[PDB]
Amino acid sequence: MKQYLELMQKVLDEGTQKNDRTGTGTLSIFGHQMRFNLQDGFPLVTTKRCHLRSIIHELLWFLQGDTNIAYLHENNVTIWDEWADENGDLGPVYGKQWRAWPTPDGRHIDQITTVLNQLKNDPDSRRIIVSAWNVGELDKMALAPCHAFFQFYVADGKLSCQLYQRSCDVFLGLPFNIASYALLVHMMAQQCDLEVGDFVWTGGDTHLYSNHMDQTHLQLSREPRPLPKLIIKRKPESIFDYRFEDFEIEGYDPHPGIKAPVAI
């Protein structure tokens, strides 16, 4: 997409070299904002075929409050394998914090239920937020949340959402993360009878790994194509009732996919 490629180039022109926790190395910039009007189309990268089946199951996995890759495997999604333990657990990551944030006194907060109820009863609220950054449980996570904090907003009947991503692998993770939240917004909007607004992406340490330069240059040579459109074929009775079969992407004509090693 225009802004994606735009950021991709910015990291190359401006990035500083950094030794990261993975002894790989990166080119990064700190602080960046991107804006996607969902009305213009679903923001699934077209300059490289992205596979939505993985994106959808992960999100659904999040919403169920699941942190074990078992489910992902049942649907043959392999993206979190390199992080799970011998039992397939990742710890209290995303899912756990979204659906059952543990209070100091032993009980749990269902942030999603809270958000749905806010959008329906108090959309003008400026506190419609979900946070995966649970300071007291970080040490228990296999990896600290990257898309860590997000807020919803309603205006003129449209639902917008801004995500704060503290760490971003521009080549591998970003195309994935963007489509994920765009999807969620579409689901929230349907469940709250609202139109989709903007998806604002804000990043902290935004980087490009050294061993991704070739595929990054290859990707920068391609012309972005018109964005697909998302169709939700069934309207579930709750935001926790969606299933893979309910989503159809239309008009998605991407450039060939690009293979690249992940930093572990």
Ligand X SMILES: *c1cc(=O)[nH]c(=O)n1[C@H]1C[C@H](O)[C@@H](COP(=O)(O)O)O1
- Which of these, 175, 108, 107, lies nearest to 147 by C-alpha position? 175
Whether 146 sits among the annotated catalytic residues: the reply is yes
Among 52, 59, 119, 172, binds ligand LYD (CB under 6 A): 172
CA distance 20 to 149: 22
Choice between 48 and 147, CB closer to a copy of itself: 147
Locus of tokens 């700190």: 30
218 binds ligand LYD (CB under 6 A): no
φ, ψ dihedrals at 30, nearest 5°: -115, 125
130 binds ligand LYD (CB under 6 A): no
Q: At closest approach, how far in Å is the CB of 253 from ligand LYD?
A: 18
Q: Report what 262 binds from a copy of itself, ligand X, ligand LYD, none; CB cut-off 5-8 Å by kind.
A: ligand LYD
Q: Which residues bind ligand X (CB under 6 A)?
A: 21, 126-127, 143-144, 146-147, 167-169, 173-174, 177
The two tokens of residue 19 are 């030794």
Choice between 70 and 155, CB closer to a copy of itself: 155
User: 87-106: which residues touch a copy of itself (CB under 8 A)?
Assistant: 101-106
User: 12-51: which residues touch ligand LYD (CB under 6 A)?
Assistant: 51
CA distance 82 to 165: 21
Q: At closest approach, how far in Å is the CB of 264 from ligand X?
A: 9
- Which of these, 202, 87, 204, 86, lies nearest to 144 by C-alpha position? 204
Is-contact 27 49, C-beta < 8 A?
no
Among 156, 223, 237, 253, binds a copy of itself (CB under 8 A): 156
Q: At closest approach, how far in Å is the CB of 65 from ligand LYD?
A: 18
CA distance 72 to 81: 9
CA distance 263 to 211: 9
| 263 belongs to an annotated ligand binding site | yes
> Which letter does DSSP use for residue 82 in this model?
G
Give whole-number Cα distances, 215 to 35, 171, 221, 244, 256, in Å. 24, 9, 10, 30, 12
The two tokens of residue 7 are 């950021």
CA distance 149 to 170: 18
Among 36, 94, 152, 176, binds ligand LYD (CB under 6 A): 176
Which residue of this chain has its Cβ atom nearest to ligand LYD in the complex? 173
- Which of these, 99, 112, 39, 75, lies nearest to 243 by C-alpha position? 75
Chain residues that interact with a copy of itself, rule: CB under 8 A: 16, 18-21, 28, 30-33, 35, 101-107, 109, 111, 124-127, 129, 131, 133-138, 144, 148-149, 151, 153, 155-156, 160, 162, 164, 166-167, 197-198, 200, 202, 204-205
Residues in the annotated binding site = 21, 51, 126-127, 166-169, 177, 207-209, 263
Residues in the annotated binding site for dUMP = 21, 126-127, 166-169, 177, 207-209
